[PDB]
Design a binder for this molecule. Structure first.
Ligand SMILES: [Fe+3]
Ligand SMILES: [Fe+3]
Ligand SMILES: [Fe+3]
Lengths: 53, 53, 53
């Protein structure tokens, strides 16, 4: 699975880690995260993220 | 022609339906969509899409 | 690289120009701007910016 970065603050969503404290379990692909989830560090929406590659 | 999904919001581009409101007619293969077209639901570019399955 | 717009005042961050007098050199992608940088016209943080197309 691909990592994604928050364009507003640079937070990296790592699929292996997930974001469990906000209900995104380890191993969740970014496309499968609920579309109301926001960046844990700056509150930016998913639409402000892009693939690392 | 295969379906493609926006990995940022989960939108599925289906070639049989196209995206006629933004000038992408039914029968347009994903690679042939004008490269300035974005995801109708979250504004992500074609570079954030992935072939389904 | 994508241009970003300040939703508070309309200032456009252009990656090719950067914002050199506030330490952001030409060629800096918005996601790589240090997170304490603000819009030079209105003081808005990076969180008030949105990608243009
Ligand atoms: Fe963020
Ligand atoms: Fe999308
Ligand atoms: Fe501003």
């Amino acid at each position: 699975m691909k990592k994604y970065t928050c364009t507003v603050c640079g937070y990296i969503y790592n699929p292996e880690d997930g974001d469990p404290d906000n209900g995104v379990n380890p191993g969740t692909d970014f496309k499968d995260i609920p579309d109301d989830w926001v960046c844990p560090l700056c509150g930016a929406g998913k639409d402000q993220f892009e693939e690392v590659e």
